[PDB]
């Protein structure tokens, strides 16, 4: 099971690019597909979304008109079509399934990522960054703009690696993650704890509402050696 | 004029591409399952990707699903790795290397090809140490879990393959007998007894115990 994004490279401004998600392993036309991004300033942004027969579209406020979004599903590919890329399109950009899991949502399968380069409610985390070492316990504070009960997912994102769902509904952990990850929280601030960190461990943490639509992530916590 | 030969390498841009080549002689291609491995200055080695005998079967670590494919053309005993929207930490020698069978162990490797761009755990003491000719050299390895003698230790000079010198803990690879090799379950120790001049490199070991292969971030024994 996984996703394969392709098509990113060096475009100049107002350029075009086609990326392309094949997804294997799984009924692709079963679930609903997004792509997500992340600048050099990073931070997980929601681009786009699209239902699972492919009839009903939504994008973020900065590429309407001028990237589309669509799906083949006799082929498990879901599309970007993306024109007129400006400076600020320069991300990692993320295909990912979003999965009703028990009574949730959450993004819980993603792609490793492809790279587009373009030359010639909100979510508080805290801290922003912090330094540890192995066997430390690990405190992450997410604070919601607004009440959104216990919809609250958490993605861990190693670096250069895609990011991976550790909790979802506030405080389930996802399957394979191991026991000393903990969330807990409801209403406006939450909490990701690591009780003894491990090697694998150092990596960007992000929570992420999943209350109200557009989905919106934290700026995330970047957790370093020393 | 049994070997492997690496090629492709080069730097680029993060979020390019490149195509590495392993080309075989000497001995048949087809019959083995063929393995790519990197090494970065912080993370001594680590096993990439690995494909069946058929080339219908690939495995993957996970920083490269879904970014590296490996296949092969067994009809021009080379083997390939296409690697995709490449990363700063992909920077790494990349060599390619053969698996071999009673134990398991990686008993061929190329001299490796540079690209620069711009779960078992083995733990290996001393990281870097420095001797004389004649000194005894005691190197350390642990395993996060009992292996019991499922594991091995290779020898690698400055551009040159890699090379098997113990198998199954304490087996010698047909390598001088100041070399040895002991223990079983967690703690194993490599021992020179007598460092010889050709003796000075970087040396692995590695479990052969559960996939995927792992190794520790290497012991560089060097000159004073």
């Known amino acids: 099971v996984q996703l394969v994004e392709s098509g990113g490279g060096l475009v100049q401004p107002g350029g075009s690019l086609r990326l392309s998600c094949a997804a294997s392993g799984f009924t692709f036309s079963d679930y609903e597909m997004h792509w997500v991004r992340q600048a050099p300033g990073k931070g997980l942004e929601w681009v786009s979304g699209?239902?699972?027969?492919?009839?009903?579209?939504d994008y973020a406020d900065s590429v309407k008109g001028r990237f589309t979004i669509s799906r083949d599903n006799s082929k498990n590919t879901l599309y970007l079509q993306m024109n007129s890329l400006r400076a600020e399109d320069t991300a990692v950009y993320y295909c990912?399934?979003?999965?009703?899991?028990?009574?949730?949502?959450?993004?819980?399968?993603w792609g490793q990522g492809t790279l587009v380069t373009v030359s010639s409610i909100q979510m508080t985390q805290s801290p922003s960054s912090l330094s540890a070492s192995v066997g430390d316990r690990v405190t992450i504070t997410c604070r919601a703009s607004q009440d959104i009960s216990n919809w609250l997912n958490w993605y861990q994102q190693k670096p250069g690696k895609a990011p991976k769902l550790l909790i979802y509904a506030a405080s389930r952990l996802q399957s394979g993650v191991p026991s000393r990850f903990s969330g807990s929280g409801s209403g406006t601030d939450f909490t990701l704890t690591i009780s003894s960190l491990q090697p694998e461990d150092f990596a960007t943490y992000y929570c992420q509402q999943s209350y109200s639509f557009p989905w919106t992530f934290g700026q995330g916590t970047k957790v370093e050696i020393k | 004029?049994?070997?492997?030969?690496?090629?492709?390498?080069?730097?680029?841009?993060?979020?390019?591409?490149?195509?590495?080549?392993?080309?075989?002689?000497?001995?048949?291609?087809?019959?083995?399952?063929?393995?790519?491995?990197?090494?970065?200055?912080?993370?001594?080695?680590?096993?990439?990707?690995?494909?069946?005998?058929?080339?219908?079967?690939?495995?993957?670590?996970?920083?490269?699903?879904?970014?590296?494919?490996?296949?092969?053309?067994?009809?021009?005993?080379?083997?390939?790795?296409?690697?995709?929207?490449?990363?700063?930490?992909?920077?790494?020698?990349?060599?390619?290397?053969?698996?071999?069978?009673?134990?398991?162990?990686?008993?061929?490797?190329?001299?490796?090809?540079?690209?620069?761009?711009?779960?078992?755990?083995?733990?290996?003491?001393?990281?870097?140490?420095?001797?004389?000719?004649?000194?005894?050299?005691?190197?350390?390895?642990?395993?996060?879990?009992?292996?019991?003698?499922?594991?091995?230790?290779?020898?690698?000079?400055?551009?040159?393959?890699?090379?098997?010198?113990?198998?199954?803990?304490?087996?010698?690879?047909?390598?001088?007998?100041?070399?040895?090799?002991?223990?079983?379950?967690?703690?194993?120790?490599?021992?020179?007894?007598?460092?010889?001049?050709?003796?000075?490199?970087?040396?692995?070991?590695?479990?052969?115990?559960?996939?995927?292969?792992?190794?520790?971030?290497?012991?560089?024994?060097?000159?004073?």
């Open positions: 699209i239902s699972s027969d492919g009839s009903d579209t």
């Open positions: 990912a399934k979003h999965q009703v899991l028990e009574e949730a949502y959450a993004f819980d399968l």
